[PDB]
Design an enzyme around this catalytic site. Structure first.
Site, short mmCIF file in Angstrom:
data_model
loop_
_atom_site.label_atom_id
_atom_site.label_comp_id
_atom_site.label_asym_id
_atom_site.label_seq_id
_atom_site.Cartn_x
_atom_site.Cartn_y
_atom_site.Cartn_z
N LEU A 22 30.15 -9.30 -20.19
CA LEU A 22 28.80 -9.33 -20.72
C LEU A 22 28.46 -8.10 -21.54
O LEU A 22 27.57 -8.16 -22.39
CB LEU A 22 27.78 -9.48 -19.59
CG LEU A 22 27.75 -10.82 -18.87
CD1 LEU A 22 27.05 -10.67 -17.54
CD2 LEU A 22 27.06 -11.87 -19.72
N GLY A 25 28.87 -0.62 -20.00
CA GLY A 25 27.95 0.43 -19.64
C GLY A 25 28.72 1.72 -19.40
O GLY A 25 29.95 1.76 -19.48
N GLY A 26 27.96 2.78 -19.11
CA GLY A 26 28.57 4.05 -18.78
C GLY A 26 29.41 4.01 -17.52
O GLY A 26 30.17 4.96 -17.26
N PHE A 27 29.31 2.93 -16.75
CA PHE A 27 30.04 2.78 -15.50
C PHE A 27 31.34 2.01 -15.68
O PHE A 27 32.31 2.29 -14.97
CB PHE A 27 29.13 2.09 -14.48
CG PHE A 27 29.65 2.14 -13.08
CD1 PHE A 27 29.73 3.35 -12.40
CD2 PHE A 27 30.05 0.99 -12.44
CE1 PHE A 27 30.21 3.40 -11.11
CE2 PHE A 27 30.52 1.03 -11.15
CZ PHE A 27 30.61 2.24 -10.48
N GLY A 28 31.37 1.06 -16.60
CA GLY A 28 32.54 0.22 -16.80
C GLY A 28 32.14 -1.04 -17.56
O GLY A 28 31.14 -1.06 -18.27
N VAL A 30 31.00 -5.08 -17.54
CA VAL A 30 30.14 -5.94 -16.73
C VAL A 30 30.58 -7.37 -16.95
O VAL A 30 30.61 -7.85 -18.09
CB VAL A 30 28.66 -5.76 -17.09
CG1 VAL A 30 27.80 -6.77 -16.32
CG2 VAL A 30 28.24 -4.31 -16.81
N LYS A 45 30.16 -5.28 -11.89
CA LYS A 45 30.40 -4.03 -12.60
C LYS A 45 31.63 -3.37 -11.99
O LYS A 45 31.64 -3.05 -10.80
CB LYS A 45 29.19 -3.09 -12.49
CG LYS A 45 27.93 -3.43 -13.31
CD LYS A 45 27.35 -2.18 -14.03
CE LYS A 45 26.21 -1.51 -13.23
NZ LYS A 45 26.04 -0.03 -13.46
N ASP A 141 15.91 7.07 -14.85
CA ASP A 141 16.59 6.45 -15.97
C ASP A 141 15.82 5.25 -16.46
O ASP A 141 16.38 4.18 -16.71
CB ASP A 141 18.02 6.06 -15.61
CG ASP A 141 18.92 5.99 -16.84
OD1 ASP A 141 18.62 6.69 -17.84
OD2 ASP A 141 19.91 5.23 -16.80
N1 LIG Z 1 22.55 -7.99 -13.51
C1 LIG Z 1 22.88 -8.27 -14.76
N2 LIG Z 1 22.78 -9.54 -15.18
C2 LIG Z 1 23.12 -9.82 -16.44
N3 LIG Z 1 23.58 -9.01 -17.38
C3 LIG Z 1 23.69 -7.76 -16.93
C4 LIG Z 1 23.37 -7.32 -15.67
N4 LIG Z 1 23.60 -5.96 -15.56
C5 LIG Z 1 24.05 -5.62 -16.74
N5 LIG Z 1 24.12 -6.66 -17.62
C6 LIG Z 1 24.62 -6.60 -18.98
O1 LIG Z 1 25.58 -5.58 -19.05
C7 LIG Z 1 25.24 -4.63 -20.08
C8 LIG Z 1 25.61 -3.26 -19.60
O2 LIG Z 1 24.50 -2.72 -18.85
P1 LIG Z 1 24.84 -1.54 -17.84
O3 LIG Z 1 26.17 -1.79 -17.23
O4 LIG Z 1 23.66 -1.24 -16.98
O5 LIG Z 1 25.02 -0.31 -18.82
P2 LIG Z 1 23.95 0.64 -19.46
O6 LIG Z 1 22.72 0.61 -18.57
O7 LIG Z 1 24.63 1.96 -19.48
O8 LIG Z 1 23.72 0.07 -20.81
C9 LIG Z 1 23.74 -4.84 -20.31
O9 LIG Z 1 23.45 -4.50 -21.66
C10 LIG Z 1 23.57 -6.33 -20.05
O10 LIG Z 1 23.83 -7.12 -21.19
#
Ligand SMILES: Nc1ncnc2c1ncn2[C@@H]1O[C@H](COP(=O)(O)OP(=O)(O)O)[C@@H](O)[C@H]1O
Length: 280
Positions: A22, A25-28, A30, A45, A141
């Site tokens: 999807l 993110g800064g974690f990996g 998704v 994640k 954040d």
């Molecule tokens: N619970 C979730 N359900 C659906 N999509 C999600 C969810 N969490 C994250 N995403 C998707 O993953 C992407 C990465 O978000 P995230 O991992 O939080 O990184 P960051 O906050 O650093 O941008 C988001 O832009 C979104 O599209």
């Protein structure tokens, strides 16, 4: 809070197939998946244990979310620390982040009342973090990518890795007083509010010096009586005068220089509900 096999994580994501990514993110990465035999849509994640900032965020998100329950907070179903991995399992938010519906996007623009209701939803989440946990939680954040939208457009707060008991959203008083209070979340939220109204990034490094930061630029245009000129073009003519004024004066107070002058989230939440009522 549920421990997951690394085998179930692979079953859910079909061994991390890029058909199910999807985003990043800064974690990996998704991943979208399903668990419990396809009744539960989730987002998974995968973080990296080499990084101990990643290790720090993994453990913080777990110790926070495992004891919180609120309609307007992303829910953490479970995790996986198997084979020295780092995996988090959330409910799937079918409509992505709030930012993907405001700008730099092909999605349709949101009507004003839906935007207002999304900000109210997020303010309820923040209000719970500040007044409903065992102690105050400071999210640290708050931003438009950390507000997610589910299949019914319910706004939900996420990304708890940096919370305690991004550029453009940073409380400027933190680089002076060096203390951190929940008023720093209020500052960040006020910037969210201006993004919803203006539909542009909080920081746009290419602009004239006075326009670079929405936090300083929007207040400036309101005092000068030209806030209406930087409003999202889709929103022009769709906000009653009294809602516009209650909304903007609520956002202005959120981004005051000094945290002690800012409203609490209870106050903000109440004034947004008032704004919604003036719109109607
Ligand atoms: N619970 C979730 N359900 C659906 N999509 C999600 C969810 N969490 C994250 N995403 C998707 O993953 C992407 C990465 O978000 P995230 O991992 O939080 O990184 P960051 O906050 O650093 O941008 C988001 O832009 C979104 O599209």
């Amino acid at each position: 809070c549920r421990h997951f096999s690394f085998a179930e994580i692979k079953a859910a994501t079909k061994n991390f197939d890029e058909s199910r990514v999807l985003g990043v993110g800064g974690f990996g990465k998704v991943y979208r998946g399903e668990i419990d035999g396809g009744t539960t849509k989730v987002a998974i994640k995968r973080g990296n244990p080499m990084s101990e900032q990643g290790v720090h965020e993994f453990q913080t998100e777990i110790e926070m979310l495992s004891k919180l329950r609120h309609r307007h907070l992303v829910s953490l179903i479970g995790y996986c620390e198997e084979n020295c991995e780092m995996i988090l399992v959330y409910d799937y938010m079918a409509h992505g982040t709030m930012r993907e519906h405001l700008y730099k996007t092909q999605n349709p623009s949101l009507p004003w009342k839906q935007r207002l209701e999304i900000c109210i939803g997020a303010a309820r989440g923040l209000h719970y973090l500040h007044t409903g946990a065992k102690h105050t939680i400071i999210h640290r954040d708050v931003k438009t990518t950390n507000i997610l939208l589910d299949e019914k457009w319910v706004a939900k707060v996420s990304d708890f890795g940096l919370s305690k008991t991004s550029f453009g959203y940073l409380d400027p008083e933190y680089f002076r007083r060096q203390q951190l209070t929940e008023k720093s979340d209020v500052y960040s939220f006020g910037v969210v509010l201006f993004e919803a109204l203006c539909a542009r990034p909080a920081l746009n490094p290419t602009l004239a010096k006075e326009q670079v930061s929405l936090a300083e630029w929007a207040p400036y245009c309101y005092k000068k009586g030209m806030l209406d000129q930087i409003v999202d073009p889709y929103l022009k003519g769709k906000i009653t005068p009294e809602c516009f004024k209650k909304f903007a004066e609520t956002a202005m107070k959120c981004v005051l220089d000094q945290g002690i002058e800012r409203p609490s989230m209870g106050d903000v939440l109440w004034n947004l509900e008032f704004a919604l009522q003036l719109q109607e």
